[PDB]
Amino acid sequence: MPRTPHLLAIQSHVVFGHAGNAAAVFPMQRIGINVWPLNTVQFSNHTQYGRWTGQVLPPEQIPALVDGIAGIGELGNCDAVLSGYLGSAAQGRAILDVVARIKQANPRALYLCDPVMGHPEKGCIVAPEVSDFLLEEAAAVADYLCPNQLELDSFCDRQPNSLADCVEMARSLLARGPRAILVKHLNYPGKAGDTFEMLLVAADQAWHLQRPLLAFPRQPVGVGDLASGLFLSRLLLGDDLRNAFEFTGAAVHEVLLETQACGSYELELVRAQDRIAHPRVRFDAVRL
Amino acid sequence: MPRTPHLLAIQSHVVFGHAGNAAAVFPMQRIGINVWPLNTVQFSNHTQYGRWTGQVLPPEQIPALVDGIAGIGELGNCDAVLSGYLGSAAQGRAILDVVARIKQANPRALYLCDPVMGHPEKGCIVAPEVSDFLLEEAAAVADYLCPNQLELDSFCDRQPNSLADCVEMARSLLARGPRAILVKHLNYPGKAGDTFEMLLVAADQAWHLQRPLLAFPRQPVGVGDLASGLFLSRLLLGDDLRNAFEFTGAAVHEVLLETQACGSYELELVRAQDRIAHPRVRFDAVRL
Ligand SMILES: [Mg+2]
Ligand SMILES: [Mg+2]
């Protein structure tokens, strides 16, 4: 059995429930990744409850922690950096500094950026300096950029007419530097109302993944965090682009099926773990 | 399949490597526990490297976080509280306040205290107010108290002549309130030099567990954290005292075997995970 990959995950932490690192870390470890969790905040619970308690790490604590890891000579063992929601451009910059430092120590390290500008329940909830930093700075250094449709539309300053337009939008982002664009959640006029769709676009290839949309009274939080981390993990474990894409789609569906069957608002990560590791159902990606 | 237990784990976090919550959380989730990780610190790496970076949570942030969970109405779902190393008596008190609040919301909740006063590599490294708080306050409310021999000897103000004396020492701690005393690491005159031994003592019963001591150039950190969390998890999953005890012994040995076979200083938790969930070898406890 080959060496276990190492991944530095720089996101929110919640004590109860699942969001950010609390949505991603356990699933990635479960499928064979040594995760280094750098928690950018510690809250009681995620913000979508409309109430929470906790303090946010000042952004300088991010490169300080990485400096500590450099101090024990371990930074070269890091195979990837993963980021998600950012509370400020200052936090974003601290993350990019850490990405550059890790790439210095290991030139093969990957950076995956999950740009978060809001959620479908509300709209854009991020300051212009955050959305501007994501496009102008993070996208310029990210190996993999993983927007939802909201961020895709903002990045491109374009609203799609069709699935074709979403494909061209993702393609147009490649000119910025990333080797692939994962659109983790599609929304375009004429998309079937009962379907959850994803796109993966590289210069090489374009893939469309379709699965049934599950009904919930309240949209569970951290699905994007889960998808991003699993996708990156699969790539570190040697999957090609299409197989990482299909695994992610299949594993996220298992979590959601378990979450739904339990009547839970929080993702049933522990209960569904065997089906994260080995999903029963595999939805095939279609080439565009 | 029965409901997944919930456990609040209130300990240190390290970004790289394994100690405190970073030694315990993943293994407990892996065997079927929903863990609520409340990180009392976030350091770059554990302190036994002799260098590290990070800030410590002020102790008032502990009941504040739990207050947040109460605010979303979830505190009653907590089945256990787990603590380990304490940086101050003030931190200890905040943990006990949280234990009392949880026991109010769920009278069946268990508190397991892993009292940490040092490690065998050095000696006692904790202030008298910490070691005094552990005995006088934590032991008075803990359902399960899990000392190493160092803490057993300090608590009893007694040095053992034999294994028999260690048994009587553990027994004498029951008068303080705990339903069982797990001595996670035994050391007494005449113990075989190549053996790792544990005791579990309840009013009911006394068990001795023996396994081979593995050779390492540097003692791996977090073995006690791993053992405490697995033990408690097994009890939440319905094991009796002897079976929780034997599972813990077996699962910790698998991690150590993988850690040793890799030539690693840090615990190989991810690599060994299938053998945490289902240990190959089971060492039988012997009744005393
Ligand atoms: Mg997200
Ligand atoms: Mg310990």
Contact B140, B176 (CB under 8 A): yes
Enumerate the domain spans of chain A: 1-288
**SS3 of A11, please?**
strand
Residue of A1, A55, A72, A255 best to disrupt the B interface, most CBs of B under 10 A: A72
> Ligand 1 centroid to A225 CA: how many Å?
5
Residue type, B10: I
Contact B170, B155 (CB under 8 A): no
Q: Given an 8 Å threshold on Cβ–Cβ distance, is A54 in contact with B32?
A: no
Contacts of B31 (CB under 8 A, 6+ apart): B230, B233, B234, B237, B251, B276, B277
Contact A178, A143 (CB under 8 A): yes
> Ligand 1 centroid to A174 CA: how many Å?
21
Q: Is B237 left (phi over 0), alpha (psi -120 to 50) or beta?
A: alpha
| Nearest in space to B177 (alpha carbons), one of B129, B128, B131, B137 | B137
CA–CA dist A233, A243 (Å, integer): 12
CA–CA dist B274, B141 (Å, integer): 34
**CA A247 to each of CA A157, B57, B81, B113, B156: distance values in angstroms, whole numbers, following the listed order:** 31, 38, 35, 40, 55
Q: Which residues in A lie closer than 8 A to residue B5 (C-beta atoms)? A: none
Could you tell me the two tokens for B217?
A: 């150039």
**SS3 of B71, please?**
helix
Q: Which residues in B lie closer than 8 A to residue A66 (C-beta atoms)? A: 15, 44
Minimum-distance CB partner of B54 among A16, A35, A68: A68
Contacts of A163 (CB under 8 A, 6+ apart): A186, A188, A190, A191, A197, A208
Contact B69, B75 (CB under 8 A): yes
CA atoms within 13 A on the CB side of B119: 14
| Nearest in space to A152 (alpha carbons), one of A105, A194, A115, A98 | A115
Q: Which ligand is nearest to the CA of B229?
A: 2
**CA of residue B183 relative to chain centroid, distance:** 10
Chain A 69-128, residues with CB within 8 Å of chain B CB atoms: 69, 71-72, 74
Fold of the domain spanning A1-288:
UDP-N-acetylmuramoyl-L-alanine:D-glutamate ligase (3.40.1190)
Contact B256, B27 (CB under 8 A): no
Residue where the block lists tokens 């508190």: B111
| A265 close to B (CB below 8 A) | no
CA–CA dist A268, A276 (Å, integer): 11
Contact B245, B158 (CB under 8 A): no
CA–CA dist B37, B209 (Å, integer): 29
Count other Cβ atoms within 10 Å, centred on residue B92. Answer: 22
| Nearest in space to B210 (alpha carbons), one of B228, B240, B186 | B186
Q: Which residues in A lie closer than 8 A to residue B34 (C-beta atoms)? A: 270
Q: In what order do the strands lie in the sheet with B80-83?
A: B54-56, B34-43, B6-14, B80-83, B110-113, B144-145, B180-183, B195-202, B205-212, B286-287
Could you tell me the two tokens for B214?
A: 């593995």
**CA B201 to each of CA B109, B166, B180: distance values in angstroms, whole numbers, following the listed order:** 21, 10, 6
Q: Which ligand is nearest to the CA of B221?
A: 2
CA–CA dist B41, B34 (Å, integer): 21
| Nearest in space to A53 (alpha carbons), one of B67, B118, B159 | B67
Minimum-distance CB partner of A271 among B4, B22, B269: B4
The whole-angstrom distance between B30's CA and the closest CA on chain A is 7
Could you tell me the two tokens for B221?
A: 């950190």
Name the strand (E) or helix (H) holding A69: helix A61-71
Q: Given an 8 Å threshold on Cβ–Cβ distance, is A68 in contact with B8?
A: no
Q: Give burial (CB, 10 Å; 0-12/13-18/19+) of A287.
A: exposed
Q: Count CB pairs under 8 A between chains A and B.
A: 128
Could you tell me the two tokens for B226?
A: 């791993």
Q: Which residues in A lie closer than 8 A to residue B53 (C-beta atoms)? A: 64-65, 67-68, 71
Q: Which residues in B lie closer than 8 A to residue A15 (C-beta atoms)? A: 8, 36-38, 65-66, 68-69
**CA B3 to each of CA A200, B7, B8: distance values in angstroms, whole numbers, following the listed order:** 37, 13, 16
Contact A28, A233 (CB under 8 A): yes
The whole-angstrom distance between A178's CA and the closest CA on chain B is 27
Contact B125, B119 (CB under 8 A): yes
DSSP-assigned letters across all residues of A123-184: -B-S-HHHHHHIIIIITTT-SEE---HHHHHHHHT---SSHHHHHHHHHHHGGGS-SEEEES
CA–CA dist B113, A92 (Å, integer): 39
Method: X-ray
Q: Is the dihedral of CA A167, A23, B44, B249 positive or negative?
A: negative
Resolution in A: 2.0
Annotated binding site of A for substrate: 12, 47-48, 225
Residue where the block lists tokens 């913000």: A47
Could you tell me the two tokens for A286?
A: 């279609």
